[PDB]
Amino acid sequence: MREVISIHVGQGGIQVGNACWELFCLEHGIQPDGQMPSDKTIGGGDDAFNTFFSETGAGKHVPRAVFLDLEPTVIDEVRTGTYRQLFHPEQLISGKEDAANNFARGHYTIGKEIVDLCLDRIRKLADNCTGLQGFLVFNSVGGGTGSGLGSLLLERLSVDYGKKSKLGFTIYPSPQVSTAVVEPYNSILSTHSLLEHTDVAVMLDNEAIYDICRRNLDIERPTYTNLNRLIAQVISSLTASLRFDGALNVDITEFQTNLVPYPRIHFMLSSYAPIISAEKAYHEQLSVAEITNSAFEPANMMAKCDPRHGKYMACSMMYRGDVVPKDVNASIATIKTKRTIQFVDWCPTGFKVGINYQPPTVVPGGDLAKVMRAVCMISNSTAIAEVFSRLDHKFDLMYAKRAFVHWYVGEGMEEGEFSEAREDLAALEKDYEEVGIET
Amino acid sequence: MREIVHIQGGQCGNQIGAKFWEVISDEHGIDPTGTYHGDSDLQLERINVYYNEATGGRYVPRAILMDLEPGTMDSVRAGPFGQLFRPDNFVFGQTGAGNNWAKGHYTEGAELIDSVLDVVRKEAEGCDCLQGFQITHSLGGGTGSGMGTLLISKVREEYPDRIMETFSVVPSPKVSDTVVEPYNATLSVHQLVENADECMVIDNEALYDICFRTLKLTTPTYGDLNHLVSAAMSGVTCCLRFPGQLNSDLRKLAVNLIPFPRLHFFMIGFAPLTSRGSQQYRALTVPELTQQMFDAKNMMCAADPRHGRYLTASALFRGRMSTKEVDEQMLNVQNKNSSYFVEWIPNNIKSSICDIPPKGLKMAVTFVGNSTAIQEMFKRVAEQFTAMFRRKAFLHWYTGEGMDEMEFTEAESNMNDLVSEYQQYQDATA
Amino acid sequence: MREIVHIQGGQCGNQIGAKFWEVISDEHGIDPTGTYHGDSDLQLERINVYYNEATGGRYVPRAILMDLEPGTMDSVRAGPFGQLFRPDNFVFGQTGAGNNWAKGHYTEGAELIDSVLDVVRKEAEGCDCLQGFQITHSLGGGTGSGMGTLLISKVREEYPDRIMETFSVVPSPKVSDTVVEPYNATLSVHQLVENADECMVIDNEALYDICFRTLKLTTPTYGDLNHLVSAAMSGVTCCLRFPGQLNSDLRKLAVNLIPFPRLHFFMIGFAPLTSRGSQQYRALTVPELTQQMFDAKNMMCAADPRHGRYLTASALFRGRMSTKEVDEQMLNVQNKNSSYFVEWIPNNIKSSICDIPPKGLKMAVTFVGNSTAIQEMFKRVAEQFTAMFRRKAFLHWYTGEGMDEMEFTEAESNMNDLVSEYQQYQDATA
Amino acid sequence: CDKYTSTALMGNWYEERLAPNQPFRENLQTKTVREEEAAISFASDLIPLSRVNRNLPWDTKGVIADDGFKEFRSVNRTSYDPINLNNYYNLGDCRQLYKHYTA
Amino acid sequence: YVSPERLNDLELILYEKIRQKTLPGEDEGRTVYRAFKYFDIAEKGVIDISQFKAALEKFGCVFDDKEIHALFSKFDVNRSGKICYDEFCGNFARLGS
Numbered sequence A: 001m002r003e004v005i006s007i008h009v010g011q012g013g014i015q016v017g018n019a020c021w022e023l024f025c026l027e028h029g030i031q032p033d034g035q036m037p038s039d040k041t042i043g044g045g046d047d048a049f050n051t052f053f054s055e056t057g058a059g060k061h062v063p064r065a066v067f068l069d070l071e072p073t074v075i076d077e078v079r080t081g082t083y084r085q086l087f088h089p090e091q092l093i094s095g096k097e098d099a100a101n102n103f104a105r106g107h108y109t110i111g112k113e114i115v116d117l118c119l120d121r122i123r124k125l126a127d128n129c130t131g132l133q134g135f136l137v138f139n140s141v142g143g144g145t146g147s148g149l150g151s152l153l154l155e156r157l158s159v160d161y162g163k164k165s166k167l168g169f170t171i172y173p174s175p176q177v178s179t180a181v182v183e184p185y186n187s188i189l190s191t192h193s194l195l196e197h198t199d200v201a202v203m204l205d206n207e208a209i210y211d212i213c214r215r216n217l218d219i220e221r222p223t224y225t226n227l228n229r230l231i232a233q234v235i236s237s238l239t240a241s242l243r244f245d246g247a248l249n250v251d252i253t254e255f256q257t258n259l260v261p262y263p264r265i266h267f268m269l270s271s272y273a274p275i276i277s278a279e280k281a282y283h284e285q286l287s288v289a290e291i292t293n294s295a296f297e298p299a300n301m302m303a304k305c306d307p308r309h310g311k312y313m314a315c316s317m318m319y320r321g322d323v324v325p326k327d328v329n330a331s332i333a334t335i336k337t338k339r340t341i342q343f344v345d346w347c348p349t350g351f352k353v354g355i356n357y358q359p360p361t362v363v364p365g366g367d368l369a370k371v372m373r374a375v376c377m378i379s380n381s382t383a384i385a386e387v388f389s390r391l392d393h394k395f396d397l398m399y400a401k402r403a404f405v406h407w408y409v410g411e412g413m414e415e416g417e418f419s420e421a422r423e424d425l426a427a428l429e430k431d432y433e434e435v436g437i438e439t
Numbered sequence B, C: 001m002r003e004i005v006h007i008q009g010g011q012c013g014n015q016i017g018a019k020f021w022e023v024i025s026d027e028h029g030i031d032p033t034g035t036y037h038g039d040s041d042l043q044l045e046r047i048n049v050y051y052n053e054a055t056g057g058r059y060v061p062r063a064i065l066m067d068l069e070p071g072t073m074d075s076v077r078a079g080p081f082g083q084l085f086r087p088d089n090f091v092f093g094q095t096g097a098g099n100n101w102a103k104g105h106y107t108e109g110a111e112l113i114d115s116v117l118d119v120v121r122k123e124a125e126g127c128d129c130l131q132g133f134q135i136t137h138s139l140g141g142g143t144g145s146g147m148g149t150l151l152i153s154k155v156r157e158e159y160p161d162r163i164m165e166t167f168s169v170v171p172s173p174k175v176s177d178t179v180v181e182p183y184n185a186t187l188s189v190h191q192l193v194e195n196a197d198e199c200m201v202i203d204n205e206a207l208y209d210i211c212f213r214t215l216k217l218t219t220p221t222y223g224d225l226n227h228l229v230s231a232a233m234s235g236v237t238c239c240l241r242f243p244g245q246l247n248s249d250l251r252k253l254a255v256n257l258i259p260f261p262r263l264h265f266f267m268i269g270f271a272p273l274t275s276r277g278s279q280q281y282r283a284l285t286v287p288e289l290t291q292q293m294f295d296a297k298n299m300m301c302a303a304d305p306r307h308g309r310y311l312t313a314s315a316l317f318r319g320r321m322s323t324k325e326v327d328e329q330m331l332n333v334q335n336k337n338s339s340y341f342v343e344w345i346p347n348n349i350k351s352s353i354c355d356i357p358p359k360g361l362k363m364a365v366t367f368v369g370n371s372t373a374i375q376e377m378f379k380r381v382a383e384q385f386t387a388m389f390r391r392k393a394f395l396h397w398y399t400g401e402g403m404d405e406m407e408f409t410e411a412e413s414n415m416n417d418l419v420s421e422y423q424q425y426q427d428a429t430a
Numbered sequence D: 001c002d003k004y005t006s007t008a009l010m011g012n013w014y015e016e017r018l019a020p021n022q023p024f025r026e027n028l029q030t031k032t033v034r035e036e037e038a039a040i041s042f043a044s045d046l047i048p049l050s051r052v053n054r055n056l057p058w059d060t061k062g063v064i065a066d067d068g069f070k071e072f073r074s075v076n077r078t079s080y081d082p083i084n085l086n087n088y089y090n091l092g093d094c095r096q097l098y099k100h101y102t103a
Numbered sequence E: 001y002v003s004p005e006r007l008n009d010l011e012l013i014l015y016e017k018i019r020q021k022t023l024p025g026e027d028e029g030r031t032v033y034r035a036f037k038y039f040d041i042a043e044k045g046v047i048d049i050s051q052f053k054a055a056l057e058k059f060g061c062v063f064d065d066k067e068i069h070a071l072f073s074k075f076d077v078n079r080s081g082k083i084c085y086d087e088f089c090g091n092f093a094r095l096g097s
């Protein structure tokens, strides 16, 4: 009766989901066929799959998912792939022509012919659901289709449903490594729409993920699927507290009312750990003390922005496993004293605690091993202004002489919208500077 | 879905197309008889891209074979895989070209173009949805440049929203092939810019240079030269026929490779290409393989790239490669050679991945680059035209079939404009 | 059950019927001796439409073959399928027509039309309920024009409640085969219009045009021309003989194709058609069938259907096909080309379906349409007729049988108005 | 093949000893390659295009020769490899307390 | 047990529908040949009776297990208990030309 609905748009979101939903299946024990393995279930989890699944009437199960992509290349592979029977056959909207990294293309001419189907599918999925708690949106902004569809879809969703909360796991361009050179334009355009419709967002830049992969798992040549696996783990840890018993539950509604000082500043950067393989762990640490220290380490952060360059506002840490309560207070007290990580003046108490019982679960044949507990942390610190500073510098240099402007201008997006986007982005950077001024 | 039509023109083109269909037939596994003998399941999911379907289970390339002399078309039919082409897809005249522009674009070509124009439209509407255009022709030749370009303008007229590409063997003065080459070349480049979106030149001079230096076969012949260029376009459309991590259609290159509406000249290259005697000795790693791609002599165009600075680059890695190696290698190449890339555009190396590599290799890279070094190519062609034009030589044929020097004057104007404008950015600073 | 008798006279008339019986027999699978060796039961259910019942289980086709010169009949029975026609039916004279209209309608025929009307009456009375008549004759031909035209005049006056068809071949301007064609041709239209409810012109040029262009036969003979028209006749009477989704008898086609009492001239076209060397390079799909249908060249009439606006159209598909496909395509073509369809009567094309395709193929289309473009055929024929008359050339032949100039002068007038009326209903809007 | 007939250590001799065959270069006279016939189609100008004697195709294999690598598998499929998952199913607890075969 | 002149009748209805699902410009062998390679995983050319139940279950035909065994066995000439897709699809193209 407390359920959620997932929104995935774009190839990046599709690939991340391909691992997120497989892990979701593995932890609750649901085969790809849609049939539960029995094995004397006798309702072992009983009322357990409501949070992410709904009854099919007799036997099988249908995940609450919606898939969107204008390019059928990945949609077909998912359809005929390892989970052929899982998703609703008609719930996978299939595109006809690729967006080809054109934000204007993805927002004003081709996008208008699929948002109707997206709204219809979302309406059908939600209405049957009883207690829709919010939205979970995965999208990519380093290209056309991702933003061009996601921003407009969220815009329509807000006017369709209103005050209902929403969370978004976007993927901004990395400081050094990226694919396209038109990525800055798409990021600048997408931030304009996303800064006033989404409440809680998380940056998951690829560069930090690669760094973390090199250091811990000792896999020098990581892959895209391996990168997606960690994001899937982060999502699972974030949403675990909503569907399992615990000593203190933190519902999805208790993030914005806990981790956003003002309506405008609503971007957070998070991390996950520990990250230890099945080879070099069992002879190791992971007493509860060291996990908390590893959480605040700068190099381990999931975004290429040093938290050491700014203060802190509020971070919510959710433990999963068998962590005894008092260990949490001990870890918090130890972390507070150290001078390396300091807080802003205006928030004396800025830690949220949540304890759940289910240990994190692992997928077969992965790089992750099984340990007895782990901690996932979400952080919003003034350092995050650096990433928006860097994305700022790139745009100005190549807009000085309207580089690649025509592909956007001739597609319908008025030339004046770039002015608005730049003005608003400049406004945002000013915003973060003042909050840190000491009292 | 998103199938692409293929257009052929001129003798130079006719040799490209026939061999081009050589490589695709095997990979899809369609034999000389048109029957299927594939091995992998993933080989049919997108067979419709280049091949239609017909009764009896046989497949035919959706091609257009077109030239003004019967002898040229005779060879393709009688040669290998000459049985894959529908007879209705052939159009030919009876008079020949004789290396005269006017005979190709105003008088002789016009009377027969209507027949050629009608054919394309019927095939174009048959497919579910057009995705683009590819034209195989030549500029230094007789029939192609004149009668081929006209079909470029005509096709672009009715279909303003479809993007297109072009393959052309621009001539090199060293290995001369015709005295009248400067005319039919500069005259051709004039009209190509205004309508042709994507054009990637291929220089025959590099073919010998690439063949003897790296291939180093005893006596390379026209069979092999056309073959290496064949793979170039085989992998250009890689994302469309196979799944992959980051699919990239033709237009993605268009958005990411043409900073301005007119500056649409690309130089391509292929790798790896190793001799018959060094086949088994080189390691197969992104590091070693990527070194060849940006090498000065691996480029497929006579223009030396190190003489100028690049603007944008996109290379489509084919086969199972660890992306991180692709990403990391990109950073290193962009840092140790900063002086050869324009500063004002940051993060100017594109990347792409695919699942299925060409048969017989686990790595394969098709490098498409937009470098300022192409100006010397036009400069070399342009300078000869001004010298020889002043004397009015070879001018009585052209003026006698509907060509007026008042037109020729404009042509040189356009060539210089591109030559002058192109080099503004090379010295431009932020 | 609505059995239809077939009547054809004239030397040219005999040849077409000589084959039209050839193919139709094959469809029902009756052997030259006439004994049944068919395959399925559907081929025998409605056999009463053409063949009657006689001794031995064989059938005698209901054909009344007529001519004025013995040359035709001695060869009609000399070829394959020369044993089906009954000995008594044939009626022929020992004089000859000599390509003169007069001797074929007033002097000789007057003493020989009694016998022909005798047999024609006997056959009709035999039918349970006569559904109509079908007539094939050549207007430019001598005996056919006179003896054939008179038969329609008399037959109408006895059985006004039955529908009449007319397959006519009117000589064209380009392919000339008779010097006295204008005179006898003109008298044909005048006498033909006032009696024949329906007519389908078939110009010889198209038959030659179809063969030299589409089928690509090096040296077509008159045999080929007969088959193409013969097959078309098979299409019109299609549903009346086999089950189907939507029945369509002869009257229904008239109801949907004769907007007014006078405009009763049609133009037919047959598809598909591809060369033996192109049969295996094509796809048999409903979309492909429809395209060739409305293309100008496919039709067997000299008039260009792109110079006017259609008033009504009809479609008769063959074989098993999806109903929705028939509807969707039919709506599409009429929409994309509004300029070529008049604006005062929507839903301007009729459709039908049958479940027995012709032998040798899987899908085919038969078209029977009425277009204002037909005005070209009479305008060109009339233009030449006026030239001859003003010089009173070759007139002495016609005056030798009692005919005066009054019938000639009127003929021009009525042929004038029929030219006018097509003009009026074409260039008029709401 | 430097102004010689191979088999002699002339300049650049290591390669030419490994040529596949190139049947065209050693049989210039047999010609043949007459398989077009008077098809009467492709095409009619009605006269079919004159058919000319075409010579040998000249071999090929310019692209790197097959390295015994068929490949032809999709990246995604092996990523999840549903074979991996089931092994974490209906199996395990295997230490061979006694002897027993199995699939 | 039942195998009267009713099993072949299903073949027509089974065939009649096949052309219904067939994409334009395709042969029933093409549509079916894909089906037997979609559900299956062995790839040696065989599946169980249930898998063949899944294959025809997609087509929409509603039959009992008794009739299902009829066609498989009728399509299982050797009695080996397995079905080969090559012969199955090719034979259908024969009837539906």
Ligand SMILES: Nc1nc2c(ncn2[C@@H]2O[C@H](COP(=O)(O)OP(=O)(O)OP(=O)(O)O)[C@@H](O)[C@H]2O)c(=O)[nH]1
Binding pocket: A010, A011, A012, A013, A015, A016, A098, A099, A100, A101, A140, A141, A142, A143, A144, A145, A146, A147, A171, A178, A179, A180, A206, A224, A227, A228, B245, B246, B247
């Ligand atoms: N780590 C990771 N990054 C991805 C993945 N897919 C896409 N990306 C990121 O996305 C950027 C390019 O945009 P894409 O996400 O591929 O696609 P898009 O922005 O939605 O636009 P399209 O190309 O039309 O799909 C790349 O630079 C990647 O950083 C993925 O599966 N894993």
Ligand SMILES: Nc1nc2c(ncn2[C@@H]2O[C@H](COP(=O)(O)OP(=O)(O)O)[C@@H](O)[C@H]2O)c(=O)[nH]1
Binding pocket: B010, B011, B012, B013, B015, B016, B067, B097, B098, B099, B138, B140, B141, B142, B143, B144, B145, B169, B177, B178, B204, B207, B222, B225, B226
């Ligand atoms: N590299 C290369 N160049 C070719 C080939 N075939 C033709 N060419 C070039 O094409 C030019 C001749 O063009 P041509 O066919 O006569 O033009 P056309 O008369 O309009 O058909 C020559 O200068 C050649 O350099 C080939 O197979 N390889």
Ligand SMILES: Nc1nc2c(ncn2[C@@H]2O[C@H](COP(=O)(O)OP(=O)(O)O)[C@@H](O)[C@H]2O)c(=O)[nH]1
Binding pocket: C009, C010, C011, C012, C013, C015, C016, C097, C099, C138, C140, C141, C142, C143, C144, C145, C169, C177, C178, C204, C207, C222, C223, C225, C226
């Ligand atoms: N298309 C076609 N036309 C024919 C054939 N045989 C005769 N004709 C035409 O018939 C005309 C001669 O007509 P004619 O014999 O005088 O007609 P008749 O007086 O009724 O016997 C010629 O001009 C031909 O055009 C044939 O086999 N095919």
Ligand SMILES: [Mg+2]
Binding pocket: A011, A071, A098, A099, A145, B247
């Ligand atoms: Mg994409």
